[PDB]
């Protein structure tokens, strides 16, 4: 089964720095590859699609990328309201699986 | 006479499943005389032969099943596009599967072949290892309806587990794609394109084993064969839908690559002005210098910078006035 | 799909899904413009319920949903209109060709879009799919922006003779617009291959042959779009199917005519094209052939009289030469000679 | 009402009332004046000439009953050739090229043309235009032109058109031949763009000759309720001089086809040549120099100095080697 | 179509000339088939051919070698045919075409062969005449496409056997029309190897064989755009000889025929691409060799002036013996080598 590894757990970064999360699966999926930010307490929204297309509503600031089976979302210019937890998602095979997330906190 | 065309001749095993609607047996043995009486039993079965190169077994099957000889000659040459094969008892179809390398790509390719004879399915292996365990296992674990039809589902149940290889081939292929563009784009290096280029030939190999695939599979189901049973006409028509979305990436991959090669063998101008001023330019400097130092050379009794005084510095300060004059006037004509 | 109009299986999707394929699910929209002889209507909603009913309107309509990533959408209004799936499977597929099919109850059309962008040396299409049954016709986008608005001008304006026509003329404006702005999009086609003549034939740079090969790619892409487009036209204008009343068929004679004159025009495209890129060729080699000059001149000027040095220059011994009398300025005399000679001959060549 | 035409300098309004019995001629710039000429059973040619003043051009077309959208499109000025039939009047638009000497500019100017019953009105642009014969010839009362209705006015305008079309394209030969003595004479890269020049006005004349064809065989196929006979012959006459201009385009496109192919090759054969020579010149006298510094050793002790007067020897050697390496250029079909 | 013969100069008026350059071999083969029985018949009689024109049951007449006028002649004058079209059947030099008569279709369609080892294309005008009951059909040499047909009417299979001429004027049409395919797969396998051959090696074979692929190609395209009209024709009205039961067939075809003519242009852009990288490489490996030869020229002709310095027989040598002058050259010699060869790298030459 695929599994995606999620780094770094936790990084602490103020506003208006470039901010990088990486997520690596340890099988090949094409580019169904999805991120999403999560408040505490509350259910997921979606901010990138097929590894590189944003959602509609989302802000532009938020991009993904990919080079073979290594992804990665970075923020351009963090915001008050972009310390939360981002999840990383294969949907290559009909067993969906998730990484582990990576708590972005204001330092 | 048959002669045979695999590289290897390392190993030969035989083995051979009866799956029946009650019961089930699996039986692995190295005589070949074994597998003689499982044609004669009413349940399909299922022969595994790996490895060709053993001439008298494969021989010794084609005259006890009733096989013409041309399937033979078929059988043992490998270098052969897939086809399909109608004959009044029996239908013959050879594939091709395929093994990827990573992190040193190469593409790898090894036949293989499928007789389907009444209640029993026989096919020729070349070597150990393919892509056919998820039948078995699901033979063993009883998964799906397979055991509940007959040959044309094993049938079936081979060519789409071949199928599914192709696919996962074409994610490698798919990865390989993207880091090959990720980095012909960041850093155009002759490594890369020494990568482009096998990949290019890689695609090309995979669009003349898969496009022949696809007439195979309209070929099995379209045509109604007698043997292949009217329930299994959906599956074939499936697997046919799924060699079209295989044919459909393939093009597109191709076109991603010729476009790469393109866009990479475009630029090819400065050198032809920025080597080529430097040849002239040096040329057209040392050359005059040269000249005037092997004129001195002369071999007579009386010249005149014999009697001139400072001679070598004159002759000094003219080569370099003439030095100076030339690279002058070649700011005059720039570059 | 000829072979008995099926609806395919993909692997990765369960057997009955129709999914989307473009790129494009921003915007949603569904836009009404109802029709008669004197009165006219038209709104803007995202109910689809609020278009069903006018399947059965007798007054020619013109449904337009823009936003098909909206499955849903698209799946209702097949349902409800008869649609069989196959159609909204390729109704739902950006990654086809211009096709035309003819059913016992409606007249299905694929067609494209182009927007060629300036500054981007690209054109990017968005297909455009009609449906043409009874008395209604139905139209799809991908995204916001059309090329339709002339006819939702005359619709409004009681211009030409589309009020008292049905909606097979609808059909024929629709398409009469698409292939109309496909000449608009030749032209600008003609003023980028005006900037690159002009680049090419002032200065040499290295993106110029970037741009030309990217401007024959555009050229390639556009011809394999438009001749499907020329296959529909000469199928609507000739197999005359139930639907379109004899009466405006040769109405479609005029966009047969048109594609035929765009499909010329991207050839001829194509060939000046090339031919730009056989001037800057050119244009290189006779940049190396200037160079090439002065180098051949300087060499055939100073070999010789470095080899005559060469041979003068040797030390043997019992011959009555080489050590002489005076023959120092013979020698001079003989290579200026022969560089007067060298001189006369470049006069001959034409050059220096 | 939006307006984007390319000259707004000048502004000038033309009436020109023709008849048998009495001729007429209008100036200034009145626009009420134009109004009543409607009214006139007697034939009316209105010229108007400068639409950047959108008023006159509004209150002639409503005065006249014309749609908005028409006036809209006369407004336009990037609008390919059409025509359109309406219950009480017909909207032509068309190309007038000029072209002027010492540049080679191929320049357009639209032109509209509407009559209704019996009153014409043009819509220039620019001042200046072609008709110039036709109104002289109205001066003049030569042809049945004044005994017939607007019809016959609006073939003669279509005529006197495809005159001017004519007219350009012998300038265009004459221009053809110049480049020609030039390219066969003297090439250089003024040349090249004179020529390409050409090549893309002869595109652009055979892209503006097929929306003409289109228009005038609309014209004379759908016999119009408004144009009643009398005009047949002569639009197909107009169609069949246009079939003709469309082959001397496609001659002239030849011819400039090959001259550029001509530059070409000269640019071709000039560094084929120049890299003979040097190649020759190097070939024949870098290895003599090669063994002349070999032969110019000082050694003390040099047995190669004294060889039965290896001098002569040498130089015969020199002789041949040259010799030969000349023969070898003949041999393989060099000179 | 019209009754006045065309008039050529310098032949007896009246005249009939094969136009082809194939004369070797002649040879007629009957296939009279019907619902329930079929008959096969080879001879070079003419004779023995003819009595088949008023046959009820569907005849196909199979005319190999048109050098022979007079079997033209004669079986156009027996069959009713038109002076004018059997002028059109001996000319070779045609390209596909379609005319409808009152009591026959005339058809002229083209086939081809390629040549491996020697990349060739060759053709051959073959021409159906469907009067009656009968299929005439004119061929210029032995060899020809439409034995599949051949194997279906001997075996019973299909539904041909049940069917009247026209059909079988389908089923010669689009046999042809799947070689047109056949002839494709080749042409794109040969299109392969040249492409990996000039991206490999440019040499003057690679040119010659990329130039004779595209003048094929301009040939196929020309050969394949009037067929497709010819098929548009048969399908579209076809009104007096041809059943409606038949045009869907007939609308098959003319679908194929444009994938093919599809084929064929994909194939001429994809030729010219390869013409643009034999250019290309060209000058990249011309672009290297001077590269190399203008690294030697400047390492080496500095060398020889220094050379030159050192070598004049003057009176004043500064250092006439000097030690160490020779290392000490040397040396320089060594210095100059080393800073050449590093600021050149500088550049990645």
């Known amino acids: 089964d695929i599994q995606m590894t999620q780094s770094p757990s936790s990084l602490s970064a103020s506003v208006g720095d470039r901010v990088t999360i990486t997520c690596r699966a340890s099988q090949s999926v094409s580019s169904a590859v999805a991120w999403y930010q999560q408040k505490p307490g509350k259910a997921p929204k979606l901010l990138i699609y097929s590894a590189s297309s944003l959602y509609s509503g989302v802000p532009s600031r938020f991009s993904g990328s990919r080079s073979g089976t290594d992804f990665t979302l970075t923020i351009s210019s963090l915001q008050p309201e972009d310390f939360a937890t981002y999840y990383c998602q294969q949907s290559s095979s009909s067993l969906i699986t998730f990484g582990q997330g990576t708590k972005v906190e204001i330092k | ?335």
């Open chain 2, 1 to 335: 006479t048959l002669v045979y065309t695999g590289k290897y001749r390392e190993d030969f095993e035989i083995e051979v499943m009866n799956y029946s609607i009650e019961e089930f047996r699996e039986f692995k043995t190295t005589d070949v005389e074994s597998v003689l009486p499982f044609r004669d039993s009413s349940t399909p079965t299922w022969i595994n032969i790996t490895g060709i190169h053993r001439t008298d077994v494969v021989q010794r099957v084609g005259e006890f099943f009733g096989i013409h000889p041309l399937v033979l000659e078929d059988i043992l040459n490998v270098h052969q596009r897939p086809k399909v094969e109608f004959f009044e008892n029996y239908v013959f179809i050879v594939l091709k599967m395929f093994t990827y390398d990573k992190n040193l790509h190469e593409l790898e390719s090894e036949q293989v072949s499928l007789i389907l004879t009444k209640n029993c399915v026989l096919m020729f292996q070349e070597k150990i290892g393919d892509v056919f365990d998820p039948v078995r296992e699901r033979i063993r674990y009883n998964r799906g309806i397979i055991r509940k039809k007959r040959a044309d589902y094993l049938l079936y149940s081979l060519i789409d587990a071949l199928v599914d290889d192709y696919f996962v081939l074409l994610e490698k292929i798919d990865d390989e794609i993207d880091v090959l563009e990720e980095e012909v784009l960041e850093r155009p290096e002759k490594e890369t394109v020494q990568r482009t280029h096998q990949l290019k030939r890689n695609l090309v190999e995979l669009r003349k084993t898969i496009w022949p695939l696809r007439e195979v599979l309209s070929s099995l189901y379209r045509d109604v064969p007698p043997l292949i049973e009217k329930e299994t006409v959906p599956y074939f028509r499936d697997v046919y839908d799924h060699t079209i979305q295989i044919a459909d990436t393939v093009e597109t991959f191709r076109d991603i690559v010729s476009g790469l090669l393109d866009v990479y063998l475009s630029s090819v101008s400065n050198k032809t002005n920025e080597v080529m001023k430097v040849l002239t330019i040096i040329a057209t400097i040392f050359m005059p210098l040269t000249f005037i130092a092997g004129i001195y050379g002369m071999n007579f009794e009386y010249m005149p910078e014999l009697r001139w005084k400072w001679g070598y510095p004159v002759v000094l300060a003219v080569m370099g006035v003439i030095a100076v004059i030339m690279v002058v006037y070649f700011k005059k004509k720039k570059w």
